[PDB]
Motif scaffolding. Structure first.
Motif, short mmCIF file in Angstrom:
data_model
loop_
_atom_site.label_atom_id
_atom_site.label_comp_id
_atom_site.label_asym_id
_atom_site.label_seq_id
_atom_site.Cartn_x
_atom_site.Cartn_y
_atom_site.Cartn_z
N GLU A 1 0.80 -1.51 0.46
CA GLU A 1 0.15 0.07 0.23
C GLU A 1 1.16 1.01 0.30
N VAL A 2 1.54 1.45 0.35
CA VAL A 2 2.75 2.49 1.14
C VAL A 2 3.33 2.75 -0.05
N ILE A 3 3.99 1.53 -0.52
CA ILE A 3 4.55 1.69 -1.90
C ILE A 3 4.14 2.16 -2.78
N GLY A 4 2.67 1.20 -3.34
CA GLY A 4 1.69 1.71 -4.78
C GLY A 4 1.47 2.85 -4.36
N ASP A 5 1.25 3.84 -3.05
CA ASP A 5 0.49 5.65 -2.81
C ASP A 5 2.71 6.53 -3.43
N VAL A 6 3.43 6.04 -3.39
CA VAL A 6 4.20 6.13 -3.83
C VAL A 6 4.63 6.38 -5.49
N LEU A 7 4.73 5.14 -5.80
CA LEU A 7 4.01 4.72 -7.45
C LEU A 7 3.43 5.25 -8.38
N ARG A 8 2.03 5.79 -7.47
CA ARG A 8 1.03 6.33 -8.00
C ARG A 8 1.35 7.88 -8.16
N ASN A 9 1.77 8.27 -7.02
CA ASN A 9 3.00 9.96 -7.31
C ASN A 9 3.62 9.98 -7.88
N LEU B 1 -1.26 -2.55 -13.16
CA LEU B 1 -1.04 -1.44 -12.21
C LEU B 1 -1.61 -0.95 -11.64
N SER B 2 -3.02 -0.98 -12.22
CA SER B 2 -3.87 0.02 -11.32
C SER B 2 -3.98 -0.56 -9.62
N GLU B 3 -4.24 -1.99 -9.81
CA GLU B 3 -4.19 -2.47 -8.60
C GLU B 3 -2.56 -2.79 -7.38
N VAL B 4 -1.46 -3.24 -8.36
CA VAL B 4 -0.26 -2.31 -7.66
C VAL B 4 -0.40 -0.70 -6.98
N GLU B 5 -0.40 0.01 -7.65
CA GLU B 5 -0.64 1.48 -7.25
C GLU B 5 -1.71 1.55 -5.51
N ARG B 6 -2.84 0.55 -5.76
CA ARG B 6 -3.56 1.08 -5.00
C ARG B 6 -3.06 0.00 -3.93
N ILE C 1 8.52 -0.84 -13.29
CA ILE C 1 8.07 0.69 -13.44
C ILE C 1 8.43 2.15 -13.61
N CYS C 2 9.56 1.41 -12.23
CA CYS C 2 10.78 2.55 -12.27
C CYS C 2 11.96 3.29 -13.06
N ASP C 3 12.30 2.18 -13.84
CA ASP C 3 12.86 2.71 -15.25
C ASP C 3 11.57 3.70 -16.23
N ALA C 4 10.39 3.07 -16.11
CA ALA C 4 9.44 3.84 -16.86
C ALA C 4 8.89 5.49 -16.36
N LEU C 5 8.85 4.98 -15.00
CA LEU C 5 9.02 7.13 -14.10
C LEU C 5 10.17 8.14 -14.25
N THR D 1 13.12 4.71 0.00
CA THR D 1 13.23 5.71 0.66
C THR D 1 12.34 6.04 1.49
N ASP D 2 11.66 7.12 0.66
CA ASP D 2 9.78 7.64 0.79
C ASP D 2 8.98 6.70 1.34
N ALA D 3 8.95 5.38 0.59
CA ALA D 3 8.35 4.59 1.04
C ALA D 3 8.11 4.28 2.84
N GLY D 4 9.83 4.29 3.32
CA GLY D 4 10.13 4.26 4.12
C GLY D 4 9.90 5.30 5.54
N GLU D 5 9.96 6.86 4.95
CA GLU D 5 9.37 7.85 5.32
C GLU D 5 7.78 7.57 5.58
N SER D 6 7.25 7.60 4.73
CA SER D 6 5.47 7.32 4.74
C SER D 6 5.14 6.02 6.03
N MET D 7 6.30 5.23 5.69
CA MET D 7 5.42 4.18 6.72
C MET D 7 6.29 4.54 7.56
N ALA D 8 6.85 5.37 7.88
CA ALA D 8 7.49 5.80 9.21
C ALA D 8 5.94 7.16 9.89
N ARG D 9 6.19 7.55 9.43
CA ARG D 9 4.41 8.33 9.43
C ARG D 9 2.98 7.97 10.18
N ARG D 10 2.85 6.53 9.67
CA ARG D 10 2.43 6.11 9.76
C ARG D 10 2.30 5.29 10.76
#
Lengths: 80, 80
Positions: free
Chosen positions: B6-14, B37-42, B55-59, B68-77
């Motif tokens: 879920e936290v990875i998916g939000d990072v990918l969607r953003n 892809l939609s289900e991964v993002e969700r 996906i990282c390469d495409a973006l 790192t961004d997922a970890g910072e988000s997960m730390a917030r949660r």
């Protein structure tokens, strides 16, 4: 180059051996086979989010720190 | 509580919407179905390390920054 599961696996292995725990003890706590945990640590099997959380719980390591440490390691690999 | 995917998916969607790209464009580039892809993002499907890298390469986003961004988000949660 380096895959998420290889960098995550090293972080999980380091978290386990930094408490002197065996594959058997962590896999029992996480309710997975010893061989599955070993392959996750070696970066050859993907751990589901549910299993990752169960391993973090068995090791009393926050998933946030696993992700941040993996990101720092992956940044090193990208920089090399 | 919150799952890695879920936290990875939000990072990918953003990362995708921050370039105004569609699910279609990123999924074509990553060679996966739009619905996958939609289900991964969700946060409802686990992305393999290979697909995450595609996906990282495409973006043009480093996997280190995703972690790192997922970890910072997960730390917030965890902190909430």
């Amino acid at each position: 180059t380096a895959l998420l599961r290889e960098v995550i696996g090293d972080v999980l292995r380091n978290a386990r051996t930094d408490q002197g725990r065996t594959l058997r003890e962590v896999s029992d706590a996480a309710r997975v086979s010893l061989g599955y945990l070993s392959e996750v640590e070696r970066g050859r099997k993907e751990a589901s989010s549910e299993l990752l959380s169960a391993i973090c719980d068995a090791l009393d390591v926050p998933l946030s720190r696993v992700l941040t440490d993996a990101g720092e390691s992956m940044a090193r690999r990208e920089h090399d």
